[PDB]
Structure formats: structure tokens, C-alpha cells
Write an enzyme that holds these catalytic residues in place. Structure first.
Site, mmCIF file in Angstrom:
data_model
loop_
_atom_site.group_PDB
_atom_site.id
_atom_site.type_symbol
_atom_site.label_atom_id
_atom_site.label_comp_id
_atom_site.label_asym_id
_atom_site.label_seq_id
_atom_site.Cartn_x
_atom_site.Cartn_y
_atom_site.Cartn_z
ATOM 1 N N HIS A 1 86.548 57.124 120.199
ATOM 2 C CA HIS A 1 87.028 55.754 120.057
ATOM 3 C C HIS A 1 88.040 55.628 118.926
ATOM 4 O O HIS A 1 88.948 54.793 118.994
ATOM 5 C CB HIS A 1 85.854 54.804 119.818
ATOM 6 C CG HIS A 1 85.204 54.315 121.075
ATOM 7 N ND1 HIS A 1 84.531 53.114 121.144
ATOM 8 C CD2 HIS A 1 85.118 54.866 122.308
ATOM 9 C CE1 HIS A 1 84.065 52.943 122.368
ATOM 10 N NE2 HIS A 1 84.409 53.991 123.095
ATOM 11 N N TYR B 1 85.181 64.333 127.133
ATOM 12 C CA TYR B 1 85.507 63.387 126.074
ATOM 13 C C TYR B 1 86.463 64.000 125.061
ATOM 14 O O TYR B 1 87.234 63.279 124.419
ATOM 15 C CB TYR B 1 84.231 62.901 125.390
ATOM 16 C CG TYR B 1 83.722 61.603 125.955
ATOM 17 C CD1 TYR B 1 84.388 60.408 125.708
ATOM 18 C CD2 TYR B 1 82.581 61.570 126.741
ATOM 19 C CE1 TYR B 1 83.924 59.218 126.223
ATOM 20 C CE2 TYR B 1 82.111 60.386 127.264
ATOM 21 C CZ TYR B 1 82.788 59.211 127.001
ATOM 22 O OH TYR B 1 82.324 58.023 127.516
ATOM 23 N N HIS C 1 73.707 65.546 124.460
ATOM 24 C CA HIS C 1 72.539 65.534 125.318
ATOM 25 C C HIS C 1 71.393 66.289 124.660
ATOM 26 O O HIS C 1 71.623 67.219 123.878
ATOM 27 C CB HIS C 1 72.843 66.163 126.685
ATOM 28 C CG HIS C 1 73.617 65.269 127.604
ATOM 29 N ND1 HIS C 1 73.891 65.607 128.914
ATOM 30 C CD2 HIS C 1 74.181 64.054 127.402
ATOM 31 C CE1 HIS C 1 74.585 64.634 129.479
ATOM 32 N NE2 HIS C 1 74.772 63.680 128.583
ATOM 33 N N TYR D 1 77.476 62.867 133.315
ATOM 34 C CA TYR D 1 77.257 61.677 132.504
ATOM 35 C C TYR D 1 76.007 60.949 132.991
ATOM 36 O O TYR D 1 75.935 60.536 134.155
ATOM 37 C CB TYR D 1 78.491 60.789 132.609
ATOM 38 C CG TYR D 1 78.696 59.789 131.493
ATOM 39 C CD1 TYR D 1 77.624 59.114 130.919
ATOM 40 C CD2 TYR D 1 79.980 59.498 131.039
ATOM 41 C CE1 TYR D 1 77.826 58.191 129.914
ATOM 42 C CE2 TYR D 1 80.193 58.581 130.037
ATOM 43 C CZ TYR D 1 79.114 57.928 129.476
ATOM 44 O OH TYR D 1 79.307 57.009 128.475
HETATM 45 MN MN LIG Z 1 73.767 67.657 130.062
#
Ligand SMILES: [Mn+2]
Ligand SMILES: *[C@@H]1O[C@H](CO)[C@@H](O[C@@H]2O[C@H](CO)[C@@H](O[C@@H]3O[C@H](CO[C@H]4O[C@H](CO)[C@@H](O)[C@H](O)[C@@H]4O)[C@@H](O)[C@H](O[C@H]4O[C@H](CO)[C@@H](O)[C@H](O)[C@@H]4O)[C@@H]3O)[C@H](O)[C@H]2NC(C)=O)[C@H](O)[C@H]1NC(C)=O
Ligand SMILES: *[C@@H]1O[C@H](CO)[C@@H](O[C@@H]2O[C@H](CO)[C@@H](O)[C@H](O)[C@H]2NC(C)=O)[C@H](O)[C@H]1NC(C)=O
Ligand SMILES: *[C@@H]1O[C@H](CO)[C@@H](O)[C@H](O)[C@H]1NC(C)=O
Ligand SMILES: *[C@@H]1O[C@H](CO)[C@@H](O)[C@H](O)[C@H]1NC(C)=O
EC number: 5.1.3.19
Length: 743
Positions: A182, A238, A429, A450
Site C-alpha cells: 500500500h 503482491y 500465510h 488468496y
Molecule cells: Mn498459502
């Protein structure tokens, strides 16, 4: 001592009041750009041409709605993203009146909006960022084609949006969560609006905005120097989001302010992050963390950027060509409507055709690569999709990567960093000791994309009689697990220390051995001593995995559950001679797995096909859930993964207090693998593999040593020196403007 490369082929251009375009190129360079489109950038111009011809064939489908309730109803980055491609097309092909008229219309529809925020995300400025950077780029690109009214009215829109982004930088996490995607995204939109205002003489606002953007970003780039492996902790997808804006920042801030970042140490490793995370066939990536099937933005733009400004040897262009030519047209991995054209214009501007596409010398050789900050091992990346060209991946590392984890935990950069408050690991994760396996380039054990941060959505273990009471019944997983319905008080303390570790990783005579240690990802109160996972790739189509769980004498655990995912195809049950297993059907044949603990007992598995909660952008996943009783203190289980070409005919496992033996016979070869209980740094080996006649030893040499990377020296002074670079540019513009008022 510095992160500058004075040789970089980005001239510091001195500013000229009210001269357009100016952002990425000047008016005198347009003629060369058009020459490139017809001769050497033809393959990129053709991508722009097809994008715009698509929009021109359905203008009402692609134009932003006049109605603000429709404009703001949905995530709407597609508006600004597609405008950038349209605007570049109009620069290269000014004789296309229909496209220029559509671009004016497009901008008018955006300029009429009372707000560029999405209706039920009031505190998220990323949609404003996409609209602003696309709108301001188009403004710069097309300035000389607009009416006087549009030139003025659109400037006020850029000023309002940029002023709002500036005000929120003091009130939102992205203003102080360094290297979170961001932050460069929202910074770059503000800087782009600021450069457009600076050029038009609005120096008071543009000085404040510019000073704020550079301070935030220059700090993050100093911190980024500690990420030695070229990776980004949020993953490849990302990461491409981050680099889209980071690379814009490095280019623009050098062109306009002579702030040079092109000797940055992280930047010269970054090619590895895109070369070594790509699966056979150049369509998918390893997809660790919150991810789609490959990349979010680009990555051809970022790759030709690396070649023109960093590598200058043709392998960035080469990798961009591989990805461009193999992209999926429909089905899994297709770039989304909103993101697919976002970076076409910078890819066009940054491609250096004089660096002919040249593959890295080891292309075609399955190679082992260890990302020592990320904590990820990969093997067989970037191969042609062929029989016996396999991909293998393993992850076990520190939350946030080594640099972020160590900065927080040893309190580095005291002036800037006050703990985890300055970083954002929400996209990671509970996935430590996870692996993936793509034999023959056919995804077998995959990442689930995701999704919700449940431990069992990754290829890892859970344990059975939890001390605590969470969701997941009595099962407990890794400390970063989040039900997202209640966050425990002070559990952030144990989440803030989540840590796997790659203990050994070596390829030797076609055999790959990887060991990881996962204790540091589970609550210490379960008195787990060792959560050890061993990968042994005996053949490109034969992977053996051995887990060893060492319980402390107190611990109350009784059972473990191991999860194995395939995001696209569900698993089917199978059993041969009392050995339970699972298989998936692919077009080229069946891919099978079989398991047993080292007493020879295999339990039948549970199978599940899960959707995802509304709001995640992908269907869901499918998994096997293999359970095993935790035998005695030390428990060990072997799993075996077979490609369609191989016919396993014996699979026996026997062990004792110190050793475990796995014997595997096929129709063509015999394999034995020996593993030992305990650690092997100093006095014996990790594993010994006996293929047919070859003896393969993995000893202390395959061990991976850990390092602290030292704090960047004079870090506050680095930022302060660079912040001085933009003041003389503002002073010169002011003098030019005063020069003209006098005359
Ligand atoms: Mn994963
Ligand atoms: C364009 O520039 C990019 C960015 O730098 C290059 O990307 C690198 O590509 C190589 C593979 O091609 C990656 O792997 C590393 O290669 C090194 C070899 O470099 C050359 O020089 C040596 C002599 O120094 C020659 O022998 C060799 O043939 C090469 O021509 C290796 O030195 C690296 O490690 C080796 O040693 C270690 C330690 O002993 C071993 O563990 C390794 O197994 C290996 O033996 C390594 O193999 C490299 O990581 C890439 N860098 C990045 C940042 O991605 C492109 O290759 C380049 N393209 C062209 C066309 O030149
Ligand atoms: C994985 O499979 C195991 C075994 O089938 C599941 O554990 C059982 O879950 C049910 C319902 O939650 C409980 O009533 C049982 O007591 C559990 N068995 C044991 C031995 O603990 C587990 O829920 C599955 N996990 C996932 C994520 O699918
Ligand atoms: C910009 O915002 C001001 C209020 O701060 C408003 O009066 C003005 O009309 C806005 N201009 C545009 C073009 O949105
Ligand atoms: C599942 O994915 C397919 C594309 O492979 C898509 O067509 C389908 O709509 C998805 N499922 C749902 C319920 O939308």
C-alpha cells in the site's frame, strides 16, 4: 558505500515551467517513441493497439460511469489502469481521432466524480491511487490535445485528489508501514500528481507533497537494503504490486530530482525473485502467501526495467518474452480485466531493444535456489514444460522475512521503527514447512491461493488436543492462524515470533534434499521439540517426504493432521495392499501419493473441496487431510509422490531409536533413503540416498548457516541527504516563473 549508480541511462532533466509532456519523457522525444513503435517496440505497441481496439469496440463497457453511485459501487482500479494504456496509445498514434476523443471522454467521466473512493472502503486510498496516477499520467501525456477548460478543470481534480492523499498519509497505516504494498502505491500516486502540479507552477502544495513522499519512500529503501536475496515477504504476486510503484519511484525521482537508487543492493538481486519463482511453462508462479496464479501487475514492465537500468544483458527482455508469449487467454491464470493493461505504457517506455533477448546461461538446467531472507527454496524454476522437468518448492522462514523480523526483534533503526507497528505482515500465510511439487510441470501439490488465513489451507501440519479453545474444534495450527472473527488478547506476542527455518538444502547428482524446522511456528505450550520435514527428490517424478515430530515428555498431543492441496483438481481415494493414498487425474495420466508411518500402518485420508468466503477472488481449493497417531515421543511418517511415468512396486519403511529407512522399488530402479533422529551440524550427516548403484551423501555441507545483516550505517543521514536533492529543482522553477512575470 552508496546505493547510486551514476552510469544509469536516465538523464537528470532540468525542469521547464509549463512544458508537456514531462513525466516520463519530453515533447522532443515523442518522435523517437513513434519510431520505436513501428520498428523495434512493435511487439509492445501491438499490445497497446489491441487493448485500445478492444476498448474502442465496446466503449460503453469500458468508459467510467457518469453516475457516481455506479462509478464508486465496485473496486474500480480498472478506470485509471486502462486510462494509462489509452493515453500512451494516443501519444504514439495521434492521427487516430476516435481514440483521442475517447480519451477526452474517459477523463471527463473521471473528473466529474465527487470521490475516487470505493463506496464501502472509506479508509482505503488504493482506489484513489489508481484513479489519480492514471488520470495524472493521461493529463501529462495528452495535455497539448486538451482544451484550455480541460487543462484547468483537470488540474484542479489532480490537486484535490493529491491533497486528499497527502492528508491521509498522516492518518493511515500506509504512511508508516514500510515496504507494505500500500505504501509505494499511494506514495506514487501522490508524487505523480505533485510532479504535474510542480510543472504548472503550484510549488507550495507540490513541495509539501513531494517532501512527504520522499521521506516515506527513502526510509523504506534504506530498510530494503537489508533484504539481500531480492525478494519481498508478501510474495511474487503482491511483490509485483510493490515493484510497479517502486520502479516508477526510482525512475521518476532520478529523472526529476537526480536521486539515484540504481546501485541499490536489493535491486541487483531482484531478477532472482522473478526468474526462480516461475514454474515450468512460464505461466504460473510458486504462489506463496496471498496470491493469484502468477503476478498482479506486469511483470514484463518490471523485467525490461531491470534490463535497461540494472542488468543490461538481455535476460530481463528474454524472461519478459517467455512470459508474454505463454500467457493464458482464458481459464486459470488469465490476468484480470482490471489489472491486465496497467503496465503496458511503462513496459513500452522502459524496453531497451538494443539488448537482444538472451537467456541466462543456466536456462534449461534444473537449478536449486535458496532465498535466505524470504526463507524459500525452489528447484527447477523457469524450465520448458516437459516430461521429467519438475518444479519443487519449500518455505520455512521468519515472519516478514529475515530483515523485517531481525529489525523488529533486535530493535534496529531506533529513530524509525518502534516494533511491528511499522510493518504489515497481514498477507502472509500460516505456511511454514509448506512445500509444492509440480512433476513434469504438471501441478500436483500446489499452493491454495488468496484466501482465509487458516493453517490447513497450506501444505502443513495441525495438532489435535489444543490447550486453548479456538475455532478448528480441538485442532491447533501455527501461531499466525486467524479466525478473523476474534483476535486473542496478547496472542500477538506469539504471532510476532512466528518462525520456520530451512536447515539444509542441496542438489547432488540429480537428487535434491531439503530439511526444514517448524517448531518456531507453533505455541511453545504444546511442548513440541521438533517439527521436522524432509524432502528427497529421488527422481523428477518421485518425491519422498518424511516428517519427524519430537514431542516433549510433558506435551498433551495425540494426533497430527497433514494437509496437501491442489487448487484446480480434487483428490480421489486409493489403496494398494493396505497402503492408503490419493490421486488426481490430469490429461497426461494419473498423479499419485501414498503414505505410511514407520510402523507400516497407513490410515485412510479425509477429502475436502472448499469454496472461499465471499470477497476472495478465487473459487477455493481441494485437499487431502492425512491424520497420524503421534507414536511415543518421536513420530515419523513417510509420503511418496509419483508421476504417471513411474510404477512403484515396493514401498517399505522401518526405523528405530536413531535411524529411519525408506525403501522404494520401481520397475526400473531401486531407492533407499536413510535419515537420522537429531541434528547434524557437526558430527554426522542429514541423509544418505542410495539410488540404483550411486551413493549420495548429504552431510554438514548441505547445512545452511544464518547471519545477521548489519544496520545500514548513517541511515538517518542517507535520507536527509536525498531530501536535499529536490529543493534546487523547486527553486529553479520559481526563478523561471518570476523571469516570465517580469517580461
Ligand atoms: Mn498459502
Ligand atoms: C544477466 O544478469 C543477471 C543478473 O545478474 C544474471 O542472473 C544470474 O544468472 C545466474 C545463472 O545464469 C544465477 O546463478 C549464478 O550464476 C553464477 C555464474 O555467473 C557467471 O560467471 C561464472 C564465473 O564467476 C561462470 O562460471 C558462469 O558460467 C557464469 O557465466 C554462479 O557463480 C552462481 O553461484 C555458483 O557458485 C555457488 C557457490 O559455489 C554455487 O552454490 C552455485 O551452484 C553456482 O555454482 C549462481 O549459479 C544468478 O543467481 C543470477 N543472478 C540473479 C541476481 O538473478 C543473468 O545470468 C545474466 N544473463 C546473461 C545472459 O549473462
Ligand atoms: C482433518 O481430519 C480429521 C479426522 O477426520 C478431523 O478431525 C476430527 O474432526 C471432527 C470434527 O471437527 C471431530 O469431531 C473429531 O474429534 C476429529 N478427530 C480427531 C482425531 O481429532 C479434522 O477436523 C480435519 N481437519 C480439516 C481442517 O479438515
Ligand atoms: C476541489 O475541492 C474543493 C473543496 O476543497 C471544491 O470546492 C472544488 O470544487 C473541488 N474541485 C474539483 C474540480 O473537484
Ligand atoms: C470457478 O472457476 C471457473 C473458472 O475456472 C468459473 O467459471 C466459475 O464461475 C467459478 N465458480 C463460481 C462458483 O463462480
Amino acid at each position: 558505500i552508496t546505493d547510486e549508480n551514476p552510469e544509469v541511462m536516465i538523464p537528470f532533466t532540468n525542469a521547464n515551467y509549463d512544458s508537456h509532456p514531462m513525466l516520463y519523457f519530453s515533447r522532443a522525444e515523442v518522435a523517437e517513441l513513434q519510431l520505436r513503435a513501428a520498428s523495434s517496440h512493435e511487439h509492445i505497441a501491438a499490445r497497446l493497439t489491441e487493448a485500445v481496439h478492444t476498448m474502442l469496440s465496446s466503449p460503453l463497457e469500458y468508459l467510467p460511469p457518469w453516475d457516481p453511485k455506479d462509478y464508486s459501487a465496485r473496486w474500480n482500479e480498472i478506470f485509471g489502469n486502462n486510462l494509462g494504456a489509452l493515453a500512451m496509445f494516443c501519444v504514439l498514434y495521434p492521427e487516430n481521432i476516435e481514440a483521442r476523443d475517447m480519451a477526452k471522454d474517459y477523463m471527463e467521466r473521471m473528473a466529474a466524480q465527487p470521490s475516487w473512493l470505493v463506496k464501502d472502503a472509506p479508509w482505503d486510498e488504493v482506489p484513489l491511487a489508481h484513479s489519480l496516477v492514471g488520470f495524472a499520467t493521461a493529463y501529462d501525456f495528452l495535455y497539448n490535445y486538451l482544451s484550455k477548460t480541460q487543462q484547468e478543470k483537470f488540474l484542479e481534480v489532480i490537486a484535490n485528489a493529491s491533497g486528499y492523499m497527502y492528508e491521509t498519509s498522516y492518518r493511515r497505516g500506509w504512511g508508516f508501514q514500510y515496504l507494505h504494498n500500500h505504501q509505494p502505491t499511494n506514495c506514487m500516486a501522490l508524487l505523480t500528481g505533485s510532479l504535474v502540479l510542480m510543472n504548472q507552477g503550484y510549488l507550495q502544495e507540490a513541495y509539501l507533497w513531494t517532501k512527504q513522499v520522499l521521506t516515506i519512500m527513502e526510509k523504506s529503501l534504506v530498510l530494503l537494503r537489508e533484504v539481500t536475496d531480492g525478494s519481498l515477504y508478501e510474495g511474487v504476486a503482491y511483490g509485483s504490486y510493490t515493484t510497479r510503484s517502486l520502479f516508477q519511484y526510482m525512475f521518476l525521482v532520478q529523472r526529476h530530482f537526480n536521486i539515484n537508487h540504481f546501485g541499490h543492493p536489493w535491486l541487483k538481486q531482484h531478477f532472482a525473485f522473478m526468474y526462480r519463482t516461475i514454474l515450468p511453462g512460464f505461466q504460473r508462479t510458486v504462489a506463496i502467501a496471498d496470491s493469484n496464479y502468477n503476478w498482479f501487475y506486469g511483470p514484463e514492465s518490471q523485467l525490461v526495467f531491470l534490463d535497461k537500468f540494472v542488468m543490461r544483458n538481455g535476460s530481463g527482455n528474454w524472461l519478459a518474452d517467455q512470459i508474454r508469449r505463454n500467457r493464458v487467454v482464458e481459464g486459470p491464470g488469465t490476468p484480470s480485466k482490471g489489472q491486465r493493461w496497467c503496465t503496458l505504457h511503462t513496459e513500452f517506455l522502459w524496453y531497451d531493444g538494443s539488448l537482444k533477448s538472451v537467456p541466462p546461461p543456466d536456462f534449461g538446467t534444473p537449478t536449486l535456489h535458496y532465498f535466505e531472507d524470504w526463507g524459500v527454496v525452489t528447484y527447477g524454476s523457469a524450465l520448458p514444460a516437459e516430461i521429467n522437468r519438475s518444479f519443487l518448492s519449500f518455505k520455512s522462514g521468519k515472519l516478514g522475512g529475515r530483515a523485517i523480523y531481525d529489525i523488529v526483534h533486535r530493535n534496529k533503526y531506533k529513530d524509525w521503527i518502534k516494533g511491528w507497528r511499522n510493518f504489515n505482515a497481514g498477507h502472509e500465510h500460516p505456511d511454514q514447512n509448506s512445500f509444492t511439487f509440480a512433476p513434469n510441470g504438471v501441478p500436483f501439490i500446489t499452493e491454495a491461493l488468496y484466501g482465509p488465513k487458516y493453517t490447513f489451507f497450506n501444505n502443513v501440519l495441525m495438532f489435535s488436543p489444543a490447550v486453548s479453545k479456538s475455532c478448528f474444534s480441538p485442532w491447533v495450527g501455527q501461531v499466525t492462524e486467524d479466525c478473523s472473527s476474534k483476535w486473542s488478547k496478547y496472542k500477538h506476542d506469539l504471532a510476532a515470533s512466528c518462525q520456520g527455518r530451512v536447515v539444509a538444502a542441496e542438489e547432488k547428482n540429480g537428487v535434491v534434499f531439503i530439511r526444514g524446522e517448524g517448531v518456531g511456528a507453533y505455541n511453545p505450550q504444546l511442548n513440541l521439540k521438533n517439527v521436522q520435514r524432509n524432502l528427497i527428490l529421488l527422481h523428477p517424478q518421485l518425491l519422498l517426504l518424511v516428517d519427524q515430530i519430537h514431542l516433549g515428555e510433558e506435551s498433551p498431543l495425540e494426533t497430527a493432521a497433514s494437509f496437501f492441496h491442489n487448487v484446480d483438481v480434487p483428490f480421489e481415494e486409493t489403496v494398494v495392499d493396505g497402503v492408503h493414498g490419493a490421486f488426481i487425474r490430469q490429461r497426461d495420466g494419473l498423479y499419485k501419493m501414498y503414505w505410511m508411518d514407520d510402523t507400516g500402518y497407513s490410515e485412510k485420508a479425509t477429502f475436502a473441496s472448499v469454496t472461499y468466503p465471499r470477497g476472495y477472488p478465487y473459487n477455493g481449493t481441494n485437499y487431502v487431510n492425512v491424520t497420524m497417531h503421534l507414536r511415543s515421543p518421536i513420530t515419523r511418517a513417510a509420503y511418496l509422490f509419483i508421476g504417471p511415468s513411474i510404477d512403484v512396486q515396493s514401498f517399505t519403511v522401518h526405523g528405530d531409536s536413531q535411524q529411519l529407512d525408506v525403501f522404494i522399488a520401481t520397475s526400473k530402479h531401486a531407492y533407499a533413503t536413510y535419515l537420522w533422529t537429531g541434528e547434524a551440524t557437526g558430527q554426522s550427516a542429514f541423509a544418505q540416498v542410495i539410488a540404483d548403484r550411486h551413493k549420495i551423501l548429504f552431510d554438514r555441507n548441505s547445512a545452511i548457516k544464518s547471519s545477521i545483516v548489519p544496520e545500514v550505517k548513517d541511515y538517518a543521514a542517507i535520507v536527509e541527504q536525498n531530501l536535499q536533492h529536490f529543493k534546487p529543482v523547486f527553486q529553479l522553477l520559481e526563478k523561471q516563473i518570476l523571469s516570465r512575470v517580469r517580461n
